[PDB]
């Protein structure tokens, strides 16, 4: 009925353009069969479907492929990413909310919603009256919105009591000074 | 494989029947662009990036032609083995905390998509919505399947119900992921 092919090229960067590992996969439906790995510097077959192509690619364009690790990868990074993806900054929005309606000694749950930031690097911490809550905190995995922004929700198990001040602390590369959002009984 | 960054410059997907192809550039799991094959145009997700860089859509067409060439050449070499359908997985969540009257966006994440052909739509109060809808291309996964996202801009209100309708050969009946302002 349906048949597909896939060509997935990957420029793996590490510490800038230092440990660049250029790879290139060849897929049929949902199965890889051929590959160019910068680490092995040569083509190799992953499954039977690849034997028939091995030697052919190495003879036809290996000099061209190795070449791209610098004319594509390294170049793109230092020439196109540096001023776009690596520069892009989106400050997170931090809001605090309570799962249940307010009360004076009923156990509820504070939720610190940290949204729309980029890059993914972020640090969120809960504080009660000034000290780091290290008991009933939990959080969602980092969520990728698919639009070049991330979000994360950090929950705190607690019980509202007058005079108490809870603070959500957040540090991000987009921020000159951390963000703190308070919530009070 | 570990790394500080990952760039996929020229992902090609070519399917048949239909001569259905996609050409994308990804960086750190987000989509830089896809090339509109019919319009021969590189469509950037973040318009402002096109001010500081570019890509000749010609590149896409060429590489897609190769996808055409390799499919079939590979289809026979495999004795016409058909693609096994997968059942998608949808999850709905808002971009930011919901506040009555404040424009927001519902995100429908659809994972384990295979093959890369699918129908994602939105229903408001159970009636069809076309306006304020946007969706991404098919992103590659590790198991070589795909994921895609659909976006619905909307105004939160007390009495409102939304569903994300997904249709795939892998599903016997169209999955509906429902959502409402809790």
């Amino acid at each position: 009925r349906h048949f597909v092919v896939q060509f997935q090229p990957f420029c793996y960067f590490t510490n800038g353009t230092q440990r660049i590992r250029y790879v290139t996969r060849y897929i049929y439906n949902r199965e890889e069969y051929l590959r160019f790995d910068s680490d092995v510097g040569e083509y190799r077959a992953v499954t039977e479907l690849g034997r028939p192509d091995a030697e052919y690619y190495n003879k036809q364009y290996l000099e061209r492929t190795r070449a791209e690790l610098d004319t594509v990868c390294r170049y793109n990074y230092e020439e196109t990413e540096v001023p776009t993806s690596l520069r892009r900054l989106e400050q997170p929005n931090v809001v605090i909310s309570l799962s249940r309606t307010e009360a004076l000694n009923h156990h509820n749950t504070l939720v610190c919603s940290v949204t729309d930031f980029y890059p993914a690097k972020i640090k969120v911490r809960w504080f009660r009256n000034g000290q780091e809550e290290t008991v009933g905190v939990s959080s969602t995995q980092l969520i990728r919105n698919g639009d070049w922004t991330f979000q994360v929700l950090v929950m705190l198990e607690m019980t509202p009591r007058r005079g108490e001040v809870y603070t959500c602390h957040v540090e991000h590369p987009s921020l000159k000074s951390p963000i703190t959002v308070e919530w009070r009984a | 494989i570990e790394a500080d960054h990952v760039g996929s410059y020229g992902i090609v997907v070519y399917q048949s029947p239909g001569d259905i192809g996609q050409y994308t550039f990804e960086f750190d799991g987000d989509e830089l662009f896809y090339v509109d094959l019919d319009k021969k145009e590189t469509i950037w997700m973040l318009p402002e990036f096109a001010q500081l860089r570019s890509f000749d859509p010609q590149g896409g067409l060429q590489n897609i032609a190769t996808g055409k060439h390799n499919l079939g050449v590979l289809t026979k070499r495999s004795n016409s083995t058909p693609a096994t359908n997968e059942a998608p997985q949808a999850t709905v969540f808002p971009k930011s905390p919901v506040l009555l009257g404040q424009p927001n966006t519902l995100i429908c994440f659809v994972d384990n998509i295979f093959p890369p052909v699918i129908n994602i739509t939105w229903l408001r109060n159970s009636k069809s919505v076309a306006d304020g809808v946007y969706e991404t291309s098919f992103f590659v996964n590790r198991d070589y399947s795909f994921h895609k996202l659909s976006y619905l801009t909307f105004i939160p209100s007390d009495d409102d119900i939304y569903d994300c309708k997904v249709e795939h050969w892998g599903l016997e009946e169209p999955v509906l992921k429902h959502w409402e302002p809790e």
């Binding site: 028939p52 791209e68 170049y75 020439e79 196109t80 | 570019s54 190769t66 390799n70």
Partner: peptide, 12 residues
């Protein structure tokens, strides 16, 4: 300036 794509190589 102009980004570069990773040539998708055609088999036999």
């Amino acid at each position: 300036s102009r980004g570069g794509a990773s040539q998708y190589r055609p088999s036999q």
